[PDB]
Design a protein around this ligand. Sequence first.
Ligand SMILES: NC(=O)c1ccc[n+]([C@@H]2O[C@H](COP(=O)([O-])OP(=O)(O)OC[C@H]3O[C@@H](n4cnc5c(N)ncnc54)[C@H](O)[C@@H]3O)[C@@H](O)[C@H]2O)c1
Ligand SMILES: NC(=O)c1ccc[n+]([C@@H]2O[C@H](COP(=O)([O-])OP(=O)(O)OC[C@H]3O[C@@H](n4cnc5c(N)ncnc54)[C@H](O)[C@@H]3O)[C@@H](O)[C@H]2O)c1
Ligand SMILES: NC(=O)c1ccc[n+]([C@@H]2O[C@H](COP(=O)([O-])OP(=O)(O)OC[C@H]3O[C@@H](n4cnc5c(N)ncnc54)[C@H](O)[C@@H]3O)[C@@H](O)[C@H]2O)c1
Ligand SMILES: NC(=O)c1ccc[n+]([C@@H]2O[C@H](COP(=O)([O-])OP(=O)(O)OC[C@H]3O[C@@H](n4cnc5c(N)ncnc54)[C@H](O)[C@@H]3O)[C@@H](O)[C@H]2O)c1
Ligand SMILES: Oc1cc(Cl)ccc1Oc1ccc(Cl)cc1Cl
Ligand SMILES: Oc1cc(Cl)ccc1Oc1ccc(Cl)cc1Cl
Ligand SMILES: Oc1cc(Cl)ccc1Oc1ccc(Cl)cc1Cl
Ligand SMILES: Oc1cc(Cl)ccc1Oc1ccc(Cl)cc1Cl
Lengths: 287, 287, 287, 287
Amino acid sequence: NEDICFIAGIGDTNGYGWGIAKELSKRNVKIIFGIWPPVYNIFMKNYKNGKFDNDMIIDKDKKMNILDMLPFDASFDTANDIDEETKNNKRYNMLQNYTIEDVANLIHQKYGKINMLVHSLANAKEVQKDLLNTSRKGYLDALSKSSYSLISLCKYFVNIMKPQSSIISLTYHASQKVVPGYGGGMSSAKAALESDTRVLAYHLGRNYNIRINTISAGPLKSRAATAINTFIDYAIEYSEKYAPLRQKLLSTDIGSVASFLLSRESRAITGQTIYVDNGLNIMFLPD
Amino acid sequence: NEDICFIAGIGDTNGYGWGIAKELSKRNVKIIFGIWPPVYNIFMKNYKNGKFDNDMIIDKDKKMNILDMLPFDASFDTANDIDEETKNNKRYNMLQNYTIEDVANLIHQKYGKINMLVHSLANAKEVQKDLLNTSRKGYLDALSKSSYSLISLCKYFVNIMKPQSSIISLTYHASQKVVPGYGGGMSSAKAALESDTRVLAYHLGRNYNIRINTISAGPLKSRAATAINTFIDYAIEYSEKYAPLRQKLLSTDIGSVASFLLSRESRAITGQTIYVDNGLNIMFLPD
Amino acid sequence: NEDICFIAGIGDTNGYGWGIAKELSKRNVKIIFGIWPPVYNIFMKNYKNGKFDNDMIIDKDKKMNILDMLPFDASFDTANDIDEETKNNKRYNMLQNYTIEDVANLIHQKYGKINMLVHSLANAKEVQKDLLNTSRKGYLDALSKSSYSLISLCKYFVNIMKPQSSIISLTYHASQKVVPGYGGGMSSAKAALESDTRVLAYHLGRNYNIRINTISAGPLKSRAATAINTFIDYAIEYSEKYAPLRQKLLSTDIGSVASFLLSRESRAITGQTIYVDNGLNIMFLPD
Amino acid sequence: NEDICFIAGIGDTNGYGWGIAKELSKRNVKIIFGIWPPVYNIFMKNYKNGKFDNDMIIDKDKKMNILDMLPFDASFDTANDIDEETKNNKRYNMLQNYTIEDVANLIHQKYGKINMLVHSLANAKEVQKDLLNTSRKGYLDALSKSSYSLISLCKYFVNIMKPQSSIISLTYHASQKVVPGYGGGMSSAKAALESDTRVLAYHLGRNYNIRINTISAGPLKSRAATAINTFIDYAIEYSEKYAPLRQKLLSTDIGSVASFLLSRESRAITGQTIYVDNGLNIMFLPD
Ligand SMILES: NC(=O)c1ccc[n+]([C@@H]2O[C@H](COP(=O)([O-])OP(=O)(O)OC[C@H]3O[C@@H](n4cnc5c(N)ncnc54)[C@H](O)[C@@H]3O)[C@@H](O)[C@H]2O)c1
Ligand SMILES: NC(=O)c1ccc[n+]([C@@H]2O[C@H](COP(=O)([O-])OP(=O)(O)OC[C@H]3O[C@@H](n4cnc5c(N)ncnc54)[C@H](O)[C@@H]3O)[C@@H](O)[C@H]2O)c1
Ligand SMILES: NC(=O)c1ccc[n+]([C@@H]2O[C@H](COP(=O)([O-])OP(=O)(O)OC[C@H]3O[C@@H](n4cnc5c(N)ncnc54)[C@H](O)[C@@H]3O)[C@@H](O)[C@H]2O)c1
Ligand SMILES: NC(=O)c1ccc[n+]([C@@H]2O[C@H](COP(=O)([O-])OP(=O)(O)OC[C@H]3O[C@@H](n4cnc5c(N)ncnc54)[C@H](O)[C@@H]3O)[C@@H](O)[C@H]2O)c1
Ligand SMILES: Oc1cc(Cl)ccc1Oc1ccc(Cl)cc1Cl
Ligand SMILES: Oc1cc(Cl)ccc1Oc1ccc(Cl)cc1Cl
Ligand SMILES: Oc1cc(Cl)ccc1Oc1ccc(Cl)cc1Cl
Ligand SMILES: Oc1cc(Cl)ccc1Oc1ccc(Cl)cc1Cl
C-alpha cells in the first residue's frame, strides 16, 4: 500500500513501458505516465475515445490503475533550458511543467513522495546511420536524450523518493556486442547507460539507500523499433529461432521482471544489468 | 498450489539453503531437503528435538511446510558408484538410496513430478590451500562435488520434472575476480559452474523448455564458510563497509531472489549469473 | 620502412602519448604530433629551448624521430564547426588547419598516406564533480571531446590510411567498475569509447581491412591526472600495493604494448580492450 | 641471447604449438618440445625422415632451432602417479621420466633454468558428447588433463624458471558463450583455465614476479579439432564469413601474439585472456 510509480516513456500500448505498467498494476501499484509532448494529445484522444480499453484489461476484468498522465520531455532539465522555439511550438505551446524538475515538483505536490521510477525512453536523430557516419550533433543528441536523461531523472527525483526506493531503465545488448543496424550512437548511449547505472548505484546507495538497475531486453516490435527501418523483424526472427528458449518474448515478460526489481524482494540487488531475452545473449554460434 | 522443490545441500539453518526454503514457503511451495549422509542423523535429531522450531516460523500463523527430508550424496550418481569404503562406513551403512539417481526415483515414487530444483552445495578437501599448492586429487574433488554434481542432478531430475520447470545453483564472484583465501580449486569449480549453467541453459531450454540460472551471493557466515582460512569475517566486514548498499546481507535476501527465479514470473530469464551481494561486485577502488 | 604514426593528444612529456612515441621511435616509426592549441606555443617554446632533449633520448644516444608537430583540436570536425569566438581567441587566432578534417588533409598532402593512428586524449569540464551532480552540458562536453573525437578521427583518417592500418585509443577501468573520483561523465565517456571501439572494428574491418583496439591503462601521474584534484596519488599507491605485479607502471610500459598493437604482429586482434595495468583489474578484495 | 621456452603439447606441425615455436624462433628463442608419449615415436620418426623440414623453414637462411624433444604426459605429476596399466603399456614401457616433475628436473639438469613456458594441450575422452550426457569420469578427465595440468606445470616449473619469466596457455570462447559441439566438459575446462589464470597471476606475480596470461584463439583446422563433432569446418566457415576481419587465421597469427606475451615487452600484462580470433568474439547478430 502506498506504492506509486512514475513511468517516463509511454506513447502507446505497444512498447515495454505499457508492459511494465500492466504487471505493476497486478501488484496494486499506482501508475503515473510521463508522455512526450509530440504524442501527448494523440495519446489522450485515443485514451478518451476508449481505444485502449482492451489493452487496459488485467487479471479477471481487473482494470489498470492509472493515477495520472503528464506531459514530459527528458531533453529539458529545468524551465530555463526550454528554448524559445520549442516553447512556442504548436504541440508544446499549450502544455506546462513538462521539464524534469517541474514534473518532479508537480508529482510531489499532488501525490507526495514516490518509491518507484522507470526510465523507458530513448531517441536518436540519426539512428538510421551507422556509427562511422553519425555526426557529432547526432551522437550527442543520442547521449543527451537516451543516457543523460537517466542521470537527470535521478538528480531531481531522489528528492521526492522514500529511502529503499528502486529505479530501473532499459538497455540492449548492442552495447556489449556488435549489432549492425543499431546506429546513430544508440549503442554508445546504451553502453554509457549501463556504466552510469553502476556509478549511480554507488552514489544513490550510499547517500539515499536507493537502488538502481537496468534491464537488457530482447526484441519487441514497438513503435520506435520500426524507426530503425526491417531490422526489428530480423532481430525477432533470429531470437525466436536461436534463443535457448524458443517462445515469443512479450512486453509483460519484461514487465514482471521490472516488477520484481522495483519491489522490496530485490533488496540486495543494485547496479546490475539483468538480461530478459530468453537467453539469446549467452549464444555464440547459431545452429 | 502444487509446486514442489527439492533443495540439495542443507545441514542446518544457517546457510542459504534454509533461507531459500523459508522464502519458497511463503509462496506455499512444498519443500524436500537433500541432506548429506554424514550429518543426516544429527540433523534429524535436532529437528525432532525442536531445535529448529523458531527457524521454521514464517509470517503470522504460518509454519515452513517440509514435505520430506532425505539422505543425499552428490558424490554418487548411481548405486553402482558406491564403493566399499562408503558402503562399509558407519554413517552410510544405516542409510540407503542416497545416490543422485536413487533420490530422483524415490521422490518421483513418493510424490510424483516436481517443478523446482535447487543446487546449494559445495565441497573441497583442500580449500585451505591456495590454488598453486592444491593437489590434482584435491582439485578434482572440488570440481566433482561442486560442479559436476549440478550436471548429474539435471541429467537425472529432468525425467521427474514438469515442462517449464526451473533450476538454480549458487556461485561466488571469486570465479571472475581474485579472492586470495578461496582455495582448493573452489574458484575453479565456481568458474566451471557458471559456464556450465550457460551450456545447460541451451540444452534444457531447447529440449525441455526448462530454465536454469545461478545466483552469485555475497558473504554469509554459514557453517562451511567458517572452514575457509575468519576469512568469512573479513569478507563480511569488507562487504558491509564498501558495498553500495550498507546493510546486512541475509540468507532470505538470496531466498527471495531464488523464489523469483524459480517462479513463472522469470519466464524469460535463463543461463544467467545474477548477483545478490548488495552491489559489491561493481566496485573497483574502495572509498 | 614507410611507417608513419599520428599521435593526437600530446602537451608534454609526462603523459602516455609521449611514452607511446618513444617506443614507436625504437621501431623506427616516423612520428607526427597533434597538439591542442591552448598549449601549442608553450610546447614549441620548451621544445625549441631544448627542454625536452633529455626526454627525447632513446636507446644508446638514439634520438626520437619527430616528423612534424601540428596544432590540433578534436572538438572541431571541419573548419565550418569553428565558432567565431574560438577562431578569434588569442591562442587560436594565429593558427590554421587545426580541425580534424584539415589535419588529415594536411598530413596527406605533406607526407602521403599513413598506417598508424593514436587517440591519446580526453577532457571533461566538470571532471571534479561526481556523476550525479554533472550538468547536461558538462556530460555532453565529456562525450564530445573524449569519445566522439575517436569516431570523427576515424571517419576522416581512413581516407588517408593504407589497408591493414591500425588504430588505438586509451581507456580506463572506471568504465566497467566504480571508481569514485572519476567524475564529470568521464566514466560514461570511457564506456562509450570501449563500446564504439567494437562497432568501429566491425565497420573498419569489413570495409577497409583496418584494425582498432583500445588500451585500458593503469594510473600514471600525467598533467591531466592532476586535474582530478589527490585522486591520482591514491590510485598509484593502491596499484603498487595491491596489483599482482608490484612494480612502478611506466608510460613506456603502455608504449611497448601500443607498439605491438599498431604493428602487423597483432594482425588478428581487433575490437579489443587490452589491459596494461600490472594486473590490478583482476583483483576483487585487497590484502 | 639466452631465452629457452618449453612448449608442452605438440604432436605435429598443424597445431598452435608449432605456430608458436616458429614465431619464437624468429626471435632466436631456444625451443624444447613436450610430446605426448603415445605419439612420441611417430613424431620422432617423421622428424628423422625429414617430413617436417619444410615446416621448419623461417625467413631467408634461417631454420627453427629445436633444442630438444621429450616425452611428456600432463596426466602424471610425479613418478609416484604412474599406474601399472601405463607402466606396462607398450608405448610407455620404452620411455622414462615423462611425468611433469621429471621433465622439469630433466630440463634443468640438461640446460639450466628457462624463462618461457607454453601450455598448449587439451584432452577430453567424451568431447563428442554434449555436456548433459557427459559422465563424471569423462568430465573430470577433461578438467584433469586440460585445466589442472596448467597448475601442476606452474608448481613444478617455477623452481627452474628465472624471475620475470612468462607463461601462456590457449583457451576458447566456448567458456564464455555457448558453442553446441564443444562437449565432454571442454567448455567447463576452458572456463576453469581462464579463471585459474587469474588466480595464478596473483600468486606467481606476488611471490616470483612471474607473469601468466591465456590466449583465446579462433578456429584452426588442427589434428585434435577434427575430433570434435566437421564441427571445425563449420567454425572456420563461420569465422571467415562473419568476423570483422575477413582473412584466414594462421597458427603463426597466434604465434606472434604468444611471442609478444612471452617477451619483456608485455611486462605490465598479467592474468589476462587475450583474444586472437580476427575479432569474431565481438559480434552478436551475424550480418
Ligand atoms: N523494443 C525493443 O525491442 C527494446 C529492446 C531493448 C531495450 N528497449 C528499450 O526500452 C525503451 C523503450 O523502448 P520501446 O521499444 O518500448 O519504445 P516506445 O515503445 O518507442 O518507447 C519509447 C518512448 O520514449 C518516448 N520518448 C522519446 N523521446 C523522448 C523525450 N525526449 N522525452 C520523453 N519521452 C521520449 C517516446 O515517445 C516513447 O513513448 C528504450 O530505452 C529502448 O531502447 C526496447
Ligand atoms: N556462505 C557464503 O557466503 C556463500 C557465498 C557464495 C555462494 N554460496 C554457495 O551456497 C552453497 C551453500 O553455501 P552455504 O554457505 O550455505 O553452506 P552450508 O551452509 O555449508 O551449505 C552447503 C551444504 O553442502 C552440503 N554438502 C557437502 N558435501 C556434500 C555432498 N557430497 N553431497 C550432498 N551435500 C553435500 C553440506 O552438508 C551443507 O549442508 C555453496 O554452493 C556455496 O558455494 C555461499
Ligand atoms: N594518466 C593516466 O593515469 C591514464 C589512465 C587510463 C587512461 N589514460 C588515458 O590516456 C589519454 C591521455 O592521458 P594522459 O594522462 O597521458 O594525459 P595528458 O598526458 O593529459 O594527455 C591528454 C592530452 O589531451 C590533450 N587534449 C585535451 N583536450 C583536447 C582537445 N579538445 N583536442 C586535442 N587534444 C586535447 C591535452 O592537451 C593533452 O596533451 C586519455 O584518453 C586518458 O583518459 C591515462
Ligand atoms: N584448434 C583450435 O582451433 C583451437 C581453438 C582455441 C584454442 N586452442 C587450444 O590450443 C591447444 C592445442 O590445440 P590444437 O588445435 O593445436 O591441438 P593439437 O594441435 O591437437 O594440440 C594439442 C596437443 O595436446 C597433446 N596432448 C593430449 N593429451 C596430452 C597429455 N595427457 N599430455 C601431454 N600432451 C597431450 C596432443 O598430443 C597434441 O599435440 C588446446 O589447449 C586447444 O584447446 C585451439
Ligand atoms: O533499444 C532498442 C533496441 C531494439 Cl532491438 C529495438 C528498439 C529499441 O529502442 C529504440 C531504438 C532507437 C531509437 Cl531512436 C529509440 C528507441 Cl526507443
Ligand atoms: O562459496 C563460498 C563463498 C564464501 Cl565467501 C563462503 C563460503 C562458500 O561456500 C563453500 C566454500 C568451501 C567449501 Cl569446501 C564448501 C562451501 Cl559450501
Ligand atoms: O582517464 C584517466 C584515468 C586516470 Cl586514473 C588519470 C587520468 C586520466 O585522464 C583524464 C581524466 C580527466 C580529464 Cl578531464 C582528462 C584526462 Cl586526459
Ligand atoms: O579448444 C579447441 C577449440 C576448437 Cl574450436 C577446436 C579444437 C580445440 O582443441 C581441442 C578440443 C577437444 C580435445 Cl579432446 C582436445 C583439443 Cl586440443
